[model samples]
Target chain A: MVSIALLREMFEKMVVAKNAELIGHYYDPDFVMYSDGLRQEFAEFSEGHRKIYASAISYAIEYDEDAWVQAPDRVAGRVWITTSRPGEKPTRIEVILIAAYRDGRIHRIWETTWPSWRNV
Target chain B: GSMVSIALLREMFEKMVVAKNAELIGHYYDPDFVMYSDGLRQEFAEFSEGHRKIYASAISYAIEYDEDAWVQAPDRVAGRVWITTSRPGEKPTRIEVILIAAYRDGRIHRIWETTWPSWRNVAALEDY
Candidate 1:
């Protein structure tokens, strides 16, 4: 079971990975990440994890509680992807991801882009 | 004692549905629950009964989510809601909401939701 303290720990690590590009430490080798949909996920998978994550310099995650209806097992929310070279304005990518948890770690993931979300 | 996890918010949402215990919304939702509806076509009665009557007719809904999802700061959770009105001639509309839910006693104390205007989709119908 993931405790507040455990979540807090992850909450901290997610921040660290964002700024440091420390995917090796934060992402499990078996870890699967998605982008918008299976097609997006496949696109990333084709490119490979290290290469894809390398493209991200900074990231942030947010939530919509009512958007998420299930309890103690799943969560749905939005995300923003920000990237920039040193001392430059970061480009932002907004999207949504709904996820499930097991033993305190992300077990599965799905994602949608901000453009598609504009349908909402 | 457990603190609130967005994952733990199930009961709270089921309660928010119209056909369910409508009387319990005020009790479940926080006073500041930011409902970013496109302005309800109907005014809400102060009594929960009024809200329940409206919601009871909502007949269909769908949920789609992924695992990479996580929460951002200040607010604790985020999500999308795709609702299909069961009433005849009604199309399922997807409303993406960004929110913060407060919890107490295993219930949602308050919630805030925001979404793109329905016109965003209406524009789609035009091109079709």
Candidate 2:
């Protein structure tokens, strides 16, 4: 079971590590992530992210709300993203992840997002 | 497990689109929704209503995270959008849009969308 402490560490790790590899390292085996272009669940999705995401610049967030979800299978979360674009402003998109964890790793994950600010 | 149920989310999404088309009317969004498109500081609903009045239909939407994610925040999410519109059964048009939707209280509370994406068009998207 991943305690809030581990969750906190994970947040801190991703904040600066461009190659955090959360999808492969921490995401549940049953993990699934989707956006406009593709949807992949489990190893299929993780594998996809590893391959396709190679070219994009990397960035993460350190935000974690202290507000416990107070519900099993719930998590309170937030963060933002940035990339290598020289003088371009960082892409400002808000994120929230609700998840279930087991054995010190995420068992399942869900998320919601908003568009990036400073849109070109 | 559900990639947060985008298919399910689309149902709610289509309603907003359809309403814009049928009514040729829309309400102003909450003032907090910043406009990254029109260079306006007005609330989202106000802009939406004005858009409905100026254009005959709401925008057609497509999601494109493009090459890869820039910043993958926790529950918040981001993506590029391509969109266009037409009157009902009038051959939906392609319009460019970049979008982000925030989920709070179990439903979307706020959204930001840009109506263009590198000039991608309807023909380019191959049904995901």
Candidate 3:
């Protein structure tokens, strides 16, 4: 259940809280994320997220309880990430993701979102 | 609980979808199946009807799997796959789909997927 809990914590603490500092706490030193059609390694991922987190954008996440498929070191689930900024209508993106754990941290993530976050 | 293997899922794509055998939809999917894809929701009846119409068209399908990305559990599986569809005198369109499916009674009951380059605008499936 560590993988599932880790994934949730990453979203709540790191994403929703917009706390870039916690990235290292929940992610492995050697992390790779694949989203949409792009891939990012640890350094690039961290830097990009830091920039976004520091911005005026805010985030909220909701999970589809029926979609979770968990194993010892991995979990696959469906979640919606709603993002908003000053005077802007919130955009909700549906993400289907799988996360793999290493040393109790998120080592890899493969996800695809509807109306891709890139376009939003 | 009936076991649902990744291999079986692969076979469903190869023999059912790629082969354009719409008749096999019932064999691989549950009666109450529901699929969520690219902001659209389709239940078993709509899904089957859409596939049948597409299969009868000039569109052809080719599927390729990302072997390393598969995550499997007793009754569910998640993976990345590319589907190429082509029509006569037209170039093929390749769409990457990341999907997770849950099974019930040895048949696919629910599927959540999102495809890149959104299959929504694809001309071949305009009516779907």
CAPRI category for model 2 = incorrect
In model 2, state the lDDT of residue A73: 33
The backbone clash count of each candidate, in order, is: 26, 33, 0
Candidate 2 regions exceeding 4 Å error are: A1-11, A18-25, A44-78, A85-120, B1-17, B21-45, B58-128
Best candidate according to DockQ:
3
Cα lDDT, all candidates: 0.44, 0.44, 0.89
User: What tens digits encode model 1's per-residue C-alpha lDDT throughout A1-120?
Assistant: 533333334435645254334433333334565443333332344345446446644544443334443446555543444545557675554544545556545555555454443322
Lowest lDDT block of 10, candidate 3 chain B: B1-10
Regions of model 3 farther than 4 Å from truth: none
Each candidate: chain B TM-score: 0.54, 0.46, 0.95
Candidate 1, B7-99: lDDT as tens digits: 555455554552356777766655434433322222223324445654565444444432235442232454444332334466655544444
> Could you give candidate 3's per-residue lDDT for residues A14-56 as a string of tens digits?
9999998999998999999999889999999999999998899
- TM-score rank, highest first? 3, 1, 2
Weakest lDDT window of 10 consecutive positions for candidate 3 chain A: A1-10
lDDT for A57 in candidate 3 is: 97
RMSD of 3: 1.3
Distance from true location, Cα of B10 in model 2, Å: 10
**lDDT by residue for model 2 (A1-120), tens:** 455555556555643453437754566676555432235578786565456456555555645243223123334344454445545666655544445565556665444444423342
TM-score of 1: 0.46
Q: lDDT at B2 for candidate 3?
A: 44
